[PDB]
Amino acid sequence: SLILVYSTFPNEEKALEIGRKLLEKRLIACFNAFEIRSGYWWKGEIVQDKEWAAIFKTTEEKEKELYEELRKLHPYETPAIFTLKVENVLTEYMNWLRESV
User: Fold this and answer.
1) What's the gap between Cα 42 and its chain centre?
2) Alpha-carbon torsion 77, 1, 25, 13, what sign?
3) Sheet holding 81-85, edge to edge
4) Which processes are annotated in GO (biological process)?
5) Nearest of 82, 93, 97, 68 to residue 4 by alpha carbon
């Protein structure tokens, strides 16, 4: 079925280049990326950062391969990579997604 894999990137160019590479490899059907502000602890201090998030849409069958490729293309050493399962999907869109990967 459809799965959404989320990650964050240091800038717009890196998010878009990785999404294009994943599409070139036919590992994902599409991506949606957007600018975010983030906050987290780093070296004992709370920091505020500006990043780009992206959601990568693909099938459950491609999840392992997508995790492996995305980890290998990521600029971050320990990137946020996690999966959100979906409960329903418009049939025609699910067919387009499945045919694409």
Assistant:
1) 23
2) negative
3) 30-42, 45-59, 2-9, 81-85
4) response to metal ion
5) 82
Query: Whose CA is closest to 68, among 24, 27, 17, 20?
Result: 27
What distance, in Å, lies between the first and last C-alpha atoms of the chain?
12
- Phi then psi for residue 50, to 5 deg, are -120, 125
- Residue 36 φ then ψ, to 5°: -135, 155
5 within 8 A of 55, measured Cβ to Cβ: yes
- Total number of domains constituting the chain: 1
Give the whole-angstrom CA distance, residue 100 versus residue 55.
16
CATH number, domain at 54?
A: 3.30.70.120
Method used to solve the structure: X-ray
**Domain range enclosing 94:** 1-101
